[PDB]
Amino acid sequence: CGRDEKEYFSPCFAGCKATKVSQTEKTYYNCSCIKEGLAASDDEGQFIDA
Amino acid sequence: SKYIMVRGFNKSRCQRRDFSYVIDKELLDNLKVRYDVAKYGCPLTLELGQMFQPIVELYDENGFIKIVDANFILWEIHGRNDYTFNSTMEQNGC
Amino acid sequence: NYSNKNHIKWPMTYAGMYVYRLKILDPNYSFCNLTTIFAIESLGMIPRS
Ligand SMILES: *[C@@H]1O[C@H](CO)[C@@H](O[C@@H]2O[C@H](CO)[C@@H](O[C@@H]3O[C@H](CO)[C@@H](O)[C@H](O)[C@@H]3O)[C@H](O)[C@H]2NC(C)=O)[C@H](O)[C@H]1NC(C)=O
Ligand SMILES: *[C@@H]1O[C@H](CO)[C@@H](O[C@@H]2O[C@H](CO)[C@@H](O)[C@H](O)[C@H]2NC(C)=O)[C@H](O)[C@H]1NC(C)=O
Give the 3-state DSSP-derived string for B55-94, with helices as H, strands as E and coil as C.
CEEEECCCCEEEECCCCEEEEECCCECCCEECCCHHHHCC
Task: Kindly list the residues from chain B whose CB atom is less than 8 angstroms away from the CB atom of residue C42.
Answer: 46, 48
CA B58, B51, C37, B76 dihedral sign is negative
Residues 6+ apart with CB under 8 A from A5: none
Contacting chains of B (3 CB pairs or more, <8 Å) are A, C
Instruction: Please state, in angstroms and rounded to a whole number, the distance separating the CA atoms of residues B84 and A44.
Output: 29
Residues 6+ apart with CB under 8 A from B6: B54, B55, B56, B57, C22, C36, C38
User: Hey, which residues 1-49 in chain C have their CB within 8 Å of chain A?
Assistant: 15-17, 41
Q: How many CB atoms lie within 10 A of CB A20?
A: 12
What is the stated resolution of the deposited model, in angstroms?
2.9
Minimal-distance CA residue of chain C relative to B72: C24
The DSSP code sequence of A10-35 is STTTTTEEE--B-SS-B--EEETTS-
Instruction: Please state, in angstroms and rounded to a whole number, the distance separating the CA atoms of residues A5 and B26.
Output: 19
State the count of interchain CB pairs (< 8 A) between A and C. 5
On whether the CB atoms of residues C16 and B90 are closer than 8 A, the answer is no
Instruction: Please state, in angstroms and rounded to a whole number, the distance separating the CA atoms of residues B82 and B27.
Output: 8
Q: Give the closest residue to C35 by CA, choosing from B6, B51, B53, B64.
A: B6
On whether the CB atoms of residues B74 and B83 are closer than 8 A, the answer is no
Instruction: Please state, in angstroms and rounded to a whole number, the distance separating the CA atoms of residues C45 and C40.
Output: 16
